[PDB]
């Protein structure tokens, strides 16, 4: 006589409540383990180099898995092939940013649109703030802000990417579900570089802004983010 369905509706609420606490603890401990990974990742590159240097040899480090490509040129007076490659990168606007994992079918595209992009190998802190500050998800093909973990957990949960930290781990350490985790991210709406561009029209090598800037994308990510 309602004594049953009083408590039964509470028993539901408690089971919903205790389940979030278990999901919170997992998110907390996945975040603690990636800290332990990034440490070991950062440490072993210095370690392998020191033992190369002790022996008198060289540790040629792993050619990078992951690039961050920023469009530097505008939308006006652009080649048809360059238009296509820029819009397959989802760089459809000036100072739009996307992560692009390196291979042969990546770089022969990035070298073909060299004059229209400034790209390089992003940091861990660069991948953090780009995902934290500028992080927007393509949910129902709508640019919805990543403010709770239940937007990444709902779209990317089937790949066990169930929080903001899992996404950062998936991008930086280019995971088996990088494509689905990176295509989830809307092309990053970055502001104009606060400090100034050197020269938009010429390559970075010849005192410009365009093309591959290996370590140096991070200085302009912080200039723009």
């Amino acid at each position: 006589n309602f004594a049953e369905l009083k408590i039964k509706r509470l028993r539901k609420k408690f089971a919903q409540k205790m389940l979030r606490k278990a999901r919170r603890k997992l998110i907390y401990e996945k975040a603690k383990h990636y800290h332990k990974e990034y440490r070991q990742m950062y440490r072993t590159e210095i370690r392998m180099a020191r033992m190369a240097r002790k022996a008198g040899n060289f540790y040629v480090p792993a050619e990078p898995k992951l690039a961050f490509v920023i469009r530097i040129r505008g939308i006006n007076g652009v080649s048809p092939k360059v238009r296509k490659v820029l819009q397959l990168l989802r760089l459809r606007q000036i100072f739009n940013g996307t992560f692009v994992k390196l291979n042969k079918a990546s770089i022969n595209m990035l070298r073909i649109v060299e004059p229209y992009i400034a790209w390089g190998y992003p940091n861990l802190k660069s991948v953090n703030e780009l995902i934290y500050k500028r992080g927007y998800g393509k949910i129902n093909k709508k640019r919805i802000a990543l403010t709770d973990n239940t937007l990444i957990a709902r779209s990317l949960g089937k790949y066990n990417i169930i929080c903001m930290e899992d996404l950062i781990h998936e991008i930086y350490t280019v995971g088996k579900h990088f494509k689905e985790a990176n295509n989830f991210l809307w092309p990053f709406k970055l502001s104009s570089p606060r400090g100034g561009m050197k020269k938009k029209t010429t390559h970075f090598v010849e005192g410009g802004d365009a093309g591959n800037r290996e370590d140096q994308i991070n200085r302009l990510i912080r200039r723009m983010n």
């Binding site: 919170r24 907390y28 800290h35 930290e165």
Partner: protein, 34 residues
């Protein structure tokens, strides 16, 4: 959530290191009196 724990650990670490640095500077001043 783990961010709070990481930040607290970093701040405590930094304070410890600053105290150590101050102690080393005091030892240097003692040597520079000797």
């Amino acid at each position: 959530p783990y961010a709070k724990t990481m930040r607290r650990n970093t701040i405590l670490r930094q304070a410890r290191n600053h105290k150590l640095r101050v102690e080393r500077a005091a030892a240097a001043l003692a040597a520079k009196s000797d």
